[PDB]
Symmetry: D2
């Protein structure tokens, strides 16, 4: 309860996942009160390595549930200082030519619209709790991806929606600056969320990770969570509309397979 | 019928608008056969400065109509070489805090999903007409905005959807490269579409155009259309996944109001 | 046709190289008067597939020679409308740790400072010849690289100098807009300049070209030259401070080696 | 608390300036041993709000002095874990057309080449001290600017050199990943370094800060220093080749002067 986020009230969505779980834990460790949101069965199966998380189920596909769960969360926290919008469908479908309406809609509705609705409700609660008055500020952090800027193959709906989130983040930063809410995105590269170092073990994918990531491995959840603490703390008071990219150099490098040690 | 696009079959959406009309005209002038798509009443009121456009009505909010109009267009052209996806709702709503579900949905459904559906159908027609076989290639050009990368105030749905289109464009470039379809975006800055130099005449907006656009004026439709010809022609055979930005230096400059001549 | 650069006076540096030679030829083809600049021995061994080039030797490492050669060029052309700054040392040195003062200096002095000096002279000549008066405009086009934004391994001086040129391009665009000079960069990806399809034939490099370039091949000089014509023509009158990227999708894609057809 | 940089050996250049001083102090506060480098007279007039800084004079224009001062620093620290390359000439000259060889050279030589030379020495020392062996890693952090990506008017040499540093940062990240050195840039927007809130008080500049920065004010040094601690700590172990942008939303927003509250 001492810590870099001492006394802050935080909601983390996608909180049963690798990045969300690590963020919930880092946040509790840094003294925040934390509501953990995810799908009901996923929350039911998750136990945090730190105690005190308040689990509240919230299906991002259900618009009424997003509002209800956000109001419930805010009532229980007594306010809202920090929102980490990390809930998302992951992965690919196949070639763009074969991408169905159903899959397009699921990724856009859950990942893009779900983020918008969560963040609009969070932003309104922050303002209602005093953000932008008496020197009080608040924090919205979206979880995007390197896919917000450059495209993986065979995932056009996921990639499109990550671009949607990138620019939603900047629109929110611009409109909410006057309300004392700072809004930024975290863009993770490949992150192993298995707990087992098995997420990227398929040989071809394993070789590609060695060639395309400068550090030559997938990331760990904690390596992303640390940026969620950084963006949320009071000291980040001039950082808004930005992305912190956490990808072992993937997006910084070309012809990584030609480098000494790999070629 | 001689010209840099001689013998090409092209569909332009948003073809009643400033940029779409200029593109239809440039394309006819460069020898392409051109289907012009837009809302029925908007097409009915538009006469092109060049003859030979084939008007086909297509409401982007109607998913079945997108497919039907695309098949009708392709049948009449006898194939498909070029698609310019320019149909879009423009402009703002107000602050992000007050942005309604209805307005979010309209911008995402028309501008982002409408572009996806048009482009998926176009891409499938290109392939069916021989793209990626016997040295035959095709061209998909999306009309985005400087808002695909940096946010205007009070337009979070429009801006989000432009980011969606930015990354859709790159996903399409990656998945369709093997099918000989090159996919790029055009990112216009402020473009006066009134025909009257009245689009940016409001004093405060007029002052901002002088300060934030290096060239110190809004663009004209023809200045955007010329890039649609460039991307569509055979010579652009190594350009894919890119954006051509046409904004008088807006996105290249900071503190433009401090420059000599303005300060 | 009427040439798209009919009557224009152009200087192209790096004119003995692949991209420069292709640009000189495209420009003569489109009706421009062209001065071709490169190192003396390189000019002496180059014959253009189009006639009329005025060869003028100019070593980028010799500052006095940059000014003298520019004044001579401008006197012979009777003015200056277009400058393509393409002269550059290419390629790598080894790891950053072992990069010598001498190599650093050679890349920075030739590729960055050489570009600055050529462009400052050119810009001054353009203004002296009437740019920015009576509706007259001019064009400065820099040849950068995908290395202007993302780094290849083992070429830190080349990559740094390309970033230098990227931001010099934007500075110039901002400062010269009031003088009617539009300034843009071309960012080529891998381009085979051998004439032989042997530039990227080394097996590991060949495999990386297939995995990292969406189009799965190196570019050809003409595929870059076409953008130089596009940027230089009167129609591109609202394009400044921008980059046209010509890289087969390299900079738009991640995990290209995982795509169907490659994995 | 335990300091987040407990036991780490750091060098901070530009340490008499606003950002450097704030970084030296944050670093001492977080338990690092710190060598503070700047010009001799500037060091001599600086007293830190935290004790323990080791002041070592180092003129970035003198290449032999860069090596000697780095070797002395490393001998005194007994190694090197963190380098913050913040030393730089600031500000403008006038229009690109009038930019002299002397000014160009001063900005490039000090800000770009000075950074390269400091970082190459630092990187070598880090490797000699055990970086990349036995799980040991190190950190190079460059201080760039929003001018690394978008140009201010009338400062072409400063802006170019900032682009240089942006891409040097990525080159270093790629080449040094195998040596366990993570390399990132901090891109500050306008930062008031007067201590007095007088840096941006000139009326036209003040109005532009309100219109172009979402937060509507200049930053403070501590708001940049906090990112230097974040990047340097062990937790940031998957962040390399990236930029953290600290600019109140400047680079994320267009037509900021049109937003409600400003228009
Ligand atoms: O890597 P990473 O940690 O981001 O990926 P991940 O898959 O580990 O985490 C994404 C999180 O988003 C959640 N999610 C997916 N669909 C949802 C929905 N419809 N409503 C609420 N949450 C949903 C998942 O349950 C998951 O916990
Ligand atoms: O500048 P600019 O020229 O791009 O802007 P614009 O408004 O001039 O053009 C956008 C075009 O998109 C069209 N459009 C809007 N909604 C549509 C829909 N639901 N279905 C089909 N077309 C639609 C508009 O009619 C318009 O012609
Ligand atoms: O085509 P591409 O750019 O991809 O590669 P390239 O190597 O084929 O072209 C680069 C051109 O720049 C020229 N150049 C290098 N140093 C020079 C100097 N110091 N002075 C004048 N010209 C110089 C080279 O001769 C070469 O012709
Ligand atoms: O903080 P901020 O960076 O925004 O601005 P700033 O001007 O306050 O800091 C820049 C620092 O870099 C230092 N510097 C400039 N030239 C130098 C040189 N040649 N050798 C060593 N140090 C030099 C300056 O003294 C200054 O302390």
């Amino acid at each position: 309860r001492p810590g870099r986020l001492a006394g802050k009230a935080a909601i983390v969505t996608g909180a049963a996942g690798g990045i969300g779980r690590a963020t919930v834990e880092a946040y509790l460790r840094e003294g925040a009160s934390v509501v953990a949101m995810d799908l009901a069965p996923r929350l039911a199966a998750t136990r945090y390595e730190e105690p005190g998380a308040i689990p509240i189920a919230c299906d991002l596909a259900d618009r009424a549930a997003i509002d209800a769960a956000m109001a419930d969360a805010v009532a229980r926290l007594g306010g809202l200082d920090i929102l980490v919008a990390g809930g998302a469908l992951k992965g690919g479908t196949g070639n763009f030519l074969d991408l169905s309406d159903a899959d397009w809609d699921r990724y856009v509705d859950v990942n893009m619209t779900g983020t918008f609705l969560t963040c609009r409700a969070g932003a309104r609660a922050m303002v209602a709790a005093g953000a932008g008055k008496d020197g009080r500020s608040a924090r919205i952090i979206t979880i995007g991806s390197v896919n917000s800027f450059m495209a993986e193959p065979e995932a056009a709906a996921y990639v499109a929606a990550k671009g949607g989130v990138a620019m939603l983040t900047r629109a929110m930063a611009v409109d909410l600056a006057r309300h004392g809410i700072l809004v930024n995105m975290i863009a993770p590269g490949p992150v192993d969320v298995t707990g087992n170092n098995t997420g990227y073990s398929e040989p071809r994918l394993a070789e590609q990770v060695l060639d395309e990531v400068a550090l030559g491995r997938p990331g760990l959840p904690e390596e992303v969570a640390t940026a969620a603490v950084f963006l949320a703390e009071d000291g980040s008071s001039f950082i808004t509309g930005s992305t912190i990219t956490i990808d072992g150099g993937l997006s910084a490098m070309i012809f990584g397979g030609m480098r000494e040690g790999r070629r």
